[PDB]
Design a protein around this ligand. Structure first.
Ligand SMILES: OC[C@H]1O[C@@H](O)[C@H](O)[C@@H](O)[C@H]1O
Ligand SMILES: OC[C@H]1O[C@@H](O)[C@H](O)[C@@H](O)[C@H]1O
Ligand SMILES: OC[C@H]1O[C@@H](O)[C@H](O)[C@@H](O)[C@H]1O
Ligand SMILES: OC[C@H]1O[C@@H](O)[C@H](O)[C@@H](O)[C@H]1O
Ligand SMILES: OC[C@H]1O[C@@H](O)[C@H](O)[C@@H](O)[C@H]1O
Ligand SMILES: [Cl-]
Ligand SMILES: [Cl-]
Ligand SMILES: [Cl-]
Ligand SMILES: [Cl-]
Ligand SMILES: [Cl-]
Lengths: 107, 108, 107, 107, 107
């Protein structure tokens, strides 16, 4: 089992780490058919999505996808500082796989 | 896959964007039979709903409909600034498809 | 489709609007068998319930009942001002059908 | 239908009211097998549980039990004043059946 | 039935108590297939996980695992002081079984 987001990311193909050390700039969610997703951006312009659930996901991910959208909403609303995101880069926008938050970390 | 609410809205018929850049003024929710819905207004009278679930909605939307109602309630309570709404304009009040929030975006 | 709580209320038999313009004074919830319900009161003495789910409710209402209890709890804990309640008056206490909140509204 | 926690409590065998008028001192929760429960204590030492779900619970209580655990967590974190608890006194620690909160009530 | 996290811990093999009396330093969560988990750390370098649901877990634990992840996220965001963690020591990082929070306690 990995002990941090960097080592978790390294277990998967087509993933990279983005280091943000920043709060989320915008949050978007949709209930439109076939676009039931969230999108977040950072102030520089970096954009990310939580993918629409689909056949690329296994059953255990269904709940985790819903959790990630809860997490991003509350993070946005509390202006919580996001440390890193693990993403799949074979999607546009990049698709969120994991998130870390560590407000007090010296950078 | 769209990158923002405006491009998202352009994928659908009978939709438009409202640019609000303002907090929600009132939040109403109902459990009454056949009116299981939410209604929000902004200070000068602009009014929106989250539709009662029905045969126009597919199963993948059911969770997202419940999520939107949660988002609107917490936005109302925290006085969070709503940037845009994507709505269907073939309903009255206009029916919410998507929402974006971006507090620090400089308005022009 | 109604655009406000007053118009929504007028659609049903056995309903009325209470205008409170006040925060909730007390919140009570129960997990006891056949009394899985919530009760709120206001400082003016008014008492209301969120009814136990039963045969008088249709399937589409089950989720909304749980949502109403969530909404009343967070309103209570944040001292959110409640504008109006739409209630059924053929139950004692009066059974909540809809709630509206509008902090800045002038009175 | 009862109008308050005291009258609700008196409808059940093996129950009693505790008048606390105080915030929760500690909150404990467990995911360990057969001990999927919550425990709260007050500064006077009073200790209570939200029981592990079981065959003594009817289906309508499962959701209410999960809600009660949500309510206690948020009450703990916001330091909300608990007015009264209704508890089953045939379990040790006594098992929570209902809760009431009423911050502005005189004591 | 145990009345506290220490006595709860002593009912299970391969467990131990960590006393932290400190807020969570970082929170990490993942939706990646087969790594649907959460990881928290403390200032002192100590790292803990909430395990991916699996065949080591009984059905009644599934809801409680999801609840624990909710509790840790909200604790991290509010800077709530964690008192003790009960963990399994036959996993790396140590797997969380229970958590207690008691802000006003004398150390
Ligand atoms: O688990 C979800 C992931 O599934 C992979 O197969 C896909 O390449 C990724 O882009 C992401 O969708
Ligand atoms: O997905 C929900 C939408 O479904 C469409 O068919 C309808 O025209 C819209 O008004 C909206 O109800
Ligand atoms: O939908 C809930 C309502 O159902 C009605 O039939 C009943 O008369 C009301 O008191 C209320 O229970
Ligand atoms: O519904 C839960 C309750 O069920 C009763 O039968 C039992 O005596 C109580 O202690 C409590 O467990
Ligand atoms: O219930 C979860 C636990 O199950 C045990 O059998 C295992 O040894 C622990 O490490 C933990 O996984
Ligand atoms: Cl892979
Ligand atoms: Cl793509
Ligand atoms: Cl009617
Ligand atoms: Cl009884
Ligand atoms: Cl064991």
């Amino acid at each position: 089992t990995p002990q941090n987001i960097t080592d978790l990311c390294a277990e998967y193909h087509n993933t990279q780490i983005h280091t943000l050390n920043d709060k989320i700039f915008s949050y978007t969610e949709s209930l439109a058919g076939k676009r039931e997703m969230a999108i977040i951006t950072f102030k520089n312009g970096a954009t990310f999505q939580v993918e629409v659930p689909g056949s690329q996901h296994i059953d255990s991910q269904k709940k985790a996808i819903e959790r990630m959208k809860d997490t991003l909403r509350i993070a946005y609303l509390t202006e919580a500082k996001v440390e890193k995101l693990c993403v799949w880069n074979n999607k546009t926008p990049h698709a969120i796989a994991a998130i870390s938050m560590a407000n007090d970390k010296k950078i």
